[PDB]
């Protein structure tokens, strides 16, 4: 039996051209009164998965 894609991570992540996955930031659509827009103009970009936790889910989404 194959390795299942852990699908629920793969709905959240974009595999770039090697890669260095993509992600959109946290805090990003729930509540917008308190967060000022200088915080928000940096959250409306995308983001690249940090090197520490990229260790633990390269085992996870290797079937893309």
């Amino acid at each position: 039996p194959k390795m299942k894609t852990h699908r629920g991570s793969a709905k959240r992540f974009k595999k770039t051209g090697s890669g260095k996955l993509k992600r959109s930031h946290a805090y990003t659509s729930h509540l917008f009164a308190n967060k000022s827009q200088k915080q928000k103009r940096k959250l409306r970009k995308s983001a690249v998965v940090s090197a520490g936790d990229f260790k633990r889910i390269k085992q996870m989404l290797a079937n893309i």
């Binding site: 629920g8 991570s9 709905k11 959240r12 974009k14 959109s24 930031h25 946290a26 659509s29 889910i57």
Partner: protein, 49 residues
């Protein structure tokens, strides 16, 4: 896993979606077409074989 801390695939949002139809007109690099010396009639049927 994250011990019991709500892990990193849940602290991060979804980004939908995937198409009902996405077509990938792929691929011809241009210097592949120097496989014809001199050559003409560049068709995918003359490129499949």
């Amino acid at each position: 896993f994250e011990g019991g801390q709500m892990p990193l695939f849940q602290r991060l949002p979804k980004r939908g979606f995937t198409n009902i139809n996405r077509k990938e007109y792929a691929v011809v690099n241009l210097d592949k077409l120097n496989g014809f010396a001199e050559g003409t009639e560049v068709t995918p049927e003359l490129l499949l074989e």
